[PDB]
Amino acid sequence: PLMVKVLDAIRGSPAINVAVHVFRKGLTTEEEFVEGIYKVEIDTKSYWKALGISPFHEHAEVVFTANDSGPRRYTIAALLSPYSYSTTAVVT
Amino acid sequence: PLMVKVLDAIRGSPAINVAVHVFRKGLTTEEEFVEGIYKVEIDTKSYWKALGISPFHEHAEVVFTANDSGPRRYTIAALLSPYSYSTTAVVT
Amino acid sequence: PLMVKVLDAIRGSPAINVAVHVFRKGLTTEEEFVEGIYKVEIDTKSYWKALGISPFHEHAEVVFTANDSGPRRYTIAALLSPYSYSTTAVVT
Amino acid sequence: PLMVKVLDAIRGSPAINVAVHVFRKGLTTEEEFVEGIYKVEIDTKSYWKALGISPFHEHAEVVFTANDSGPRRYTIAALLSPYSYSTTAVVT
Amino acid sequence: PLMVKVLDAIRGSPAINVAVHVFRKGLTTEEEFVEGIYKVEIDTKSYWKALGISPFHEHAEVVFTANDSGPRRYTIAALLSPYSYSTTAVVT
Amino acid sequence: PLMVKVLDAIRGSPAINVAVHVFRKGLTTEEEFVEGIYKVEIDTKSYWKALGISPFHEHAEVVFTANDSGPRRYTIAALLSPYSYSTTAVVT
């Protein structure tokens, strides 16, 4: 007998991010995968991935140049941080 | 007997993001995959992915230039952060 | 016997994003995939994906230039953050 | 008999990020993998990954240049830090 | 009989990040792996990973240059640090 | 009989990061691995990893240059340090 009881008595006004998970039992392969329960990506860049089988196999000349140079201002007050009876703010 | 009881007694006015999941049992392959329960992507860039089988196999000349240079201001007060009886704000 | 009871007693005025999921049992392939329960994408760019089988196989000259340079102001007060009895605002 | 009781008596207004997980039993391969319970990535860049089988197998000349040089100001007040009866703020 | 009771009596307004996990029983391979309970990555860069089988097998000339030189100011007040009745702030 | 009771009597407003884990029983391989309970990485860079089987097997000339030279100011007030009734701040 598998019993799971979570947040049974929520009183007043709490801030909660609950993620309950119960389980009873050619190039890339993923099986029985759980992902992104609470994934947060900012400025994530993948230039080349999984090009393929036999890419540039023979006589190949390749020039790769990656220049990251930008005035980007990523300003996040709260990330994955539930709050209660609080004062949160951003001032510029 | 598998019993799952979540947030049974919600009193007052809480802020909650609950994600319950119960399970009882040529190039890219994904099987039985759960993803994006709460995925948040900002400025995510993939230039080349999974080009293919035999890409640029022979006698190939390739020039790749990636120039990221932009005045972007990504301003997010709250992300994945439920709040209660709070004062949240953005001021410019 | 699989029983799942969620948010059984919602009292007052809570803010909730609940996603319950119960399961009992040539190039890209996805099987039994759950995605986008709560996916939020901002400024997500994929230049080239899955070009194909035998792309630019022989004698191919390719010039790729990616220039990201724009005055974009992405201003989001609340994202995936349910709120209650709160004051949220944006001021410019 | 497996019984799991979590956050049974939530009184007042707490801020909580709870993630309960109960389990009873050619190039890349992942099996029975749980990931991203609470993953937060900022400025994560992978230039080349999983190119493929036999890439640049013979007579290949490749020049790779990676120049990261940008005035980026990543300013995050709270990350994965739930708060209560607090005052959080950003001032410029 | 396996019984796990956590945070049974939450009184007042605590800030908690609880992660309970109970378990009863060609190149890269991962099995029964749990990861990212609370993973936070900042400025993590992998230039080349898992290139592939037989990469640059014969007669290959490769020049790799990695130049990290950028005025980036990563300013994070709180990371994975729940707080209560506190005053947290950033001032420039 | 295995019984685990944690944080049974939480009084007032504590700040806690609790992670309870109970278990009862070609190149890289990981089995039954738990990782990232609370992993925090800043400026972690891996230039080359797991290139592959037979990489640069014969007649290979490779020049590798890694130049890390950037005015980066990583300023983190609190990391993995829950606080209570405290005043934390950053001033420039």
Author numbering:
A (entry chain C), B (entry chain B), C (entry chain A), D (entry chain D), E (entry chain E), F (entry chain F): 11 to 35, 57 to 123
How did the manuscript describe this experimental structure?
Systemic ATTR amyloidosis is an increasingly important protein misfolding disease that is provoked by the formation of amyloid fibrils from transthyretin protein. To investigate the relationship between mutation, disease manifestation and fibril morphology, we have determined the cryo-electron microscopy (cryo-EM) structures of several ATTR amyloid fibrils, which were isolated from the amyloidotic tissue of patients with hereditary ATTR amyloidosis. Based on cryo-EM, however, we find essentially the same fibril structure in all patients, demonstrating that the mutations do not necessarily lead to different fibril morphologies. Each molecular layer consists of two discrete density regions that correspond to two ordered segments of the fibril protein: an N-terminal segment, extending from P11 to K35, and a C-terminal segment that spans from G57 to T123 of TTR protein.
Each patient was heterozygous for a different mutational variant of the TTR protein (V20I, G47E and V122I, mutational sites refer to mature TTR). The first patient (TTR V20I) is a man who was diagnosed at the age of 56. He underwent cardiac surgery one year later, due to acute heart failure, but no additional symptoms were noticed. For the three fibrils we obtained spatial resolutions of 3.18 Å (V20I) 2.37 Å (G47E) and 2.99 Å (V122I), based on the 0.143 Fourier shell correlation (FSC) criterion. The other two mutations (V20I and V122I) are seen in our 3D maps and occur within the fibril cross-β structure. Yet, they exist in different chemical environments: while residue 20 is part of the N-terminal fibril protein segment and located at a buried and hydrophobic position, residue 122 is located in the C-terminal fibril protein segment and affects a solvent-exposed position. Both mutational changes are chemically conservative and insert not more than a single methylene group into the mutant protein, all suggesting that the two mutations are not stabilizing or destabilizing to the fibril structure. All three fibril samples contain both mutant and WT TTR protein. A superposition of the three structures shows that the fibril protein folds are virtually identical. The backbone root-mean-square deviation of all 92 resolved backbone Cα atoms was analyzed with Chimera25 and found to range from 0.5 Å to 0.7 Å for the three structures.
